[PDB]
Design a protein around this ligand. Structure first.
Ligand SMILES: CC(=O)N[C@H]1[C@H]([C@H](O)[C@H](O)CO)O[C@](O)(C(=O)O)C[C@@H]1O
Ligand SMILES: [Zn+2]
Ligand SMILES: [Zn+2]
Length: 310
């Protein structure tokens, strides 16, 4: 307890994100000879991820998770990461961030403007849609009161497929599902399982609409005060946690549909061509709203070859 550091997250203690942060935490403690202890604060105990990003910026929190897409809060063209159906697989998400001019500049702005250092990137699942009635095709989204996070790209997903979006914090979601204050939500299969949303949702549609990555972030105010050896400890441990993280989500996606079926959830596979078609005006509005910077970021993402990690 030379450094008593803290890691906040929206995920709960059953979740892949917690499990991976636990590995991060335990490895940092070991490979730092006990000089660094990391405590974990899940389930939004410190606020949502907008609050925790601000806490990293002002140095009041040491570590947290964010998606690349979340930086649309500060740079609207960064929403390109979460335009539904634009990023096809995790390979694309990795190259969008690290192997494009747009993404390399985002990392630099994250450092110089927002005070956060990007330690590592993991895969955080592809979002699906649960509901209290079957989504057999895009038609069934009409009138669906669909909970979304407080995030404009999730809002737009629900809106352009014809649903009625209802933003609310992740910690509020189980209650709203349980009482039918909303008709459904959208999250990767992992969250549907670890947050027990399947207990309170009879239907799951494979909409595959947004791919989530996950960034291991550290406050610059924290990172700068660590000796270089301990900086290296934290970076190595972040990278090792991220590979564990990704494997948890990949393996889970081979598996969880079966699990949910055992629980009595009905799985549908709606035709996704009309879903993808309905986003085309949204892409246009994005480019209209964000200008050259958004158009250029989108062209850069679109050109990435979906095949082969890097
Ligand atoms: C790093 C992080 O906190 N991810 C969280 C995301 C993002 O906030 C959202 O996708 C916008 O970026 O929202 C959830 O999926 C949600 O509330 O449904 C929970 C998840 O834990
Ligand atoms: Zn329409
Ligand atoms: Zn299937």
């Amino acid at each position: 307890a030379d450094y008593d550091l803290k890691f906040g997250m929206n995920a709960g203690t059953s979740c892949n994100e917690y499990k991976a942060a636990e590995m991060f935490a335990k490895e940092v403690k070991e490979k730092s000879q006990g000089k660094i202890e990391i405590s974990l604060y899940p389930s939004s105990q410190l606020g949502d991820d907008r609050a925790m990003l601000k806490q990293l910026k002002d140095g009041s929190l040491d570590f947290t998770f964010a998606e690349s897409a979340r930086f649309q809060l500060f740079y609207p063209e960064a929403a390109v990461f979460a335009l539904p159906y634009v990023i096809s697989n995790y390979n694309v998400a990795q190259k969008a961030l690290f192997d494009t001019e747009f993404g390399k500049d985002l990392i630099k702005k994250m450092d110089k403007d927002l005070g956060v250092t990007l330690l590592s990137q993991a895969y955080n699942g592809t979002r699906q849609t649960t509901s209290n009635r079957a989504i057999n095709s895009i038609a069934d989204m009409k009138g669906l009161k669909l909970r979304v996070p407080n995030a404009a790209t999730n809002l737009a997903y629900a809106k352009y497929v014809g649903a009625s979006p209802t933003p609310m914090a992740f910690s509020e979601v189980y209650l709203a599902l349980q009482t039918n204050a909303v008709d459904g939500q959208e999250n990767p299969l992992a969250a549907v399982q670890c947050q027990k949303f399947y207990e309170v949702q009879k239907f799951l549609a494979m909409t595959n609409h947004i791919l989530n990555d996950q960034l291991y972030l550290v406050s610059n105010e924290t990172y700068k005060e660590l000796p270089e050896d301990l900086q290296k400890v934290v970076k190595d441990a972040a990278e090792n946690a991220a590979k564990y993280h990704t494997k948890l989500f990949v393996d889970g996606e081979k598996d969880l549909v079966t699990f949910f079926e055992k629980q009595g959830v009905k799985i549908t596979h709606p035709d996704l061509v009309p879903f993808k078609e309905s986003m085309k005006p949204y892409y246009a509005e994005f480019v209209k709203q964000t200008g050259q910077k958004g158009e250029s970021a989108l062209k850069q993402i679109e050109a990435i070859n979906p095949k082969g990690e890097a």
